[PDB]
Write an enzyme that holds these catalytic residues in place. Structure first.
Site, short mmCIF file in Angstrom:
data_model
loop_
_atom_site.label_atom_id
_atom_site.label_comp_id
_atom_site.label_asym_id
_atom_site.label_seq_id
_atom_site.Cartn_x
_atom_site.Cartn_y
_atom_site.Cartn_z
N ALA A 1 25.56 42.48 41.66
CA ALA A 1 24.23 42.53 41.05
C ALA A 1 23.71 41.18 40.59
O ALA A 1 22.53 41.03 40.30
CB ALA A 1 24.25 43.48 39.87
N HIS B 1 29.47 45.00 36.41
CA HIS B 1 29.10 43.80 35.68
C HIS B 1 27.87 44.05 34.81
O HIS B 1 27.75 43.52 33.70
CB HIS B 1 28.83 42.64 36.64
CG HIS B 1 30.03 42.24 37.44
ND1 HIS B 1 30.36 42.82 38.64
CD2 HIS B 1 30.99 41.32 37.19
CE1 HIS B 1 31.46 42.26 39.11
NE2 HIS B 1 31.87 41.35 38.25
N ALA B 2 26.96 44.87 35.33
CA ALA B 2 25.73 45.19 34.61
C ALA B 2 26.07 45.76 33.24
O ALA B 2 25.33 45.57 32.27
CB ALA B 2 24.91 46.18 35.41
N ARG C 1 35.59 37.87 38.74
CA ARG C 1 36.75 38.48 38.12
C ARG C 1 37.73 37.48 37.55
O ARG C 1 37.92 36.39 38.09
CB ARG C 1 37.50 39.39 39.11
CG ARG C 1 36.68 40.56 39.59
CD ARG C 1 37.45 41.41 40.56
NE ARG C 1 36.58 42.39 41.18
CZ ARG C 1 36.93 43.19 42.17
NH1 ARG C 1 38.15 43.13 42.67
NH2 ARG C 1 36.05 44.04 42.69
N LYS D 1 36.27 42.36 35.36
CA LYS D 1 35.05 41.74 35.84
C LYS D 1 34.49 40.95 34.69
O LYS D 1 34.65 41.33 33.54
CB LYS D 1 34.07 42.83 36.30
CG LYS D 1 34.66 43.73 37.38
CD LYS D 1 33.74 44.88 37.69
CE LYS D 1 34.42 45.90 38.57
NZ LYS D 1 33.87 45.91 39.96
N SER E 1 29.85 39.13 41.77
CA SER E 1 29.28 40.35 41.23
C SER E 1 28.18 40.75 42.22
O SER E 1 27.37 39.92 42.65
CB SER E 1 28.67 40.09 39.86
OG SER E 1 27.59 40.97 39.61
#
Length: 113
Positions: free
Chosen positions: A88, A45-46, A70, A20, A86
């Site tokens: 988020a 991702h965070a 990705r 990611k 993602s």
């Protein structure tokens, strides 16, 4: 208290499989650019964003996540595919990510979905 963007690499990406990544904009103090960051060690991702925005503060840089997705790095066939999103941050503009990536990996065939 001057922050130098020419020192923060545009692309810092792992080199073997699928991971990611996120497209982040760093902001210098009164001056701005977008950077590619993606790692195999992150479940989310965070996590990448936390880590990187953290390092940026130590350089006097502000961070903003402009999306994620990705990257499929096939070091063997010299190929790097950029796709997805993602949950988020939503999808990133993979065209910009591949611009900076291809600039760093010219021998590579870069693409985005």
């Amino acid at each position: 208290a001057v922050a130098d963007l020419a020192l923060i690499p545009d692309v810092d990406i792992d080199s073997d499989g699928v991971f990611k990544y996120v497209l982040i904009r760093v902001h210098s103090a009164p001056e701005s650019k977008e950077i590619v960051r993606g790692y195999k060690w992150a479940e989310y991702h965070a996590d990448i964003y936390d880590k990187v925005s953290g390092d940026m503060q130590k350089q006097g840089c502000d961070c903003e996540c402009l999306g994620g997705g990705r990257i499929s790095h096939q070091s063997q066939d010299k190929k790097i595919h950029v796709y997805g999103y993602s949950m988020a941050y939503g999808p990133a503009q993979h065209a910009i990510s591949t611009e900076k990536i291809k600039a760093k990996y010219p021998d590579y065939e870069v693409t985005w979905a």
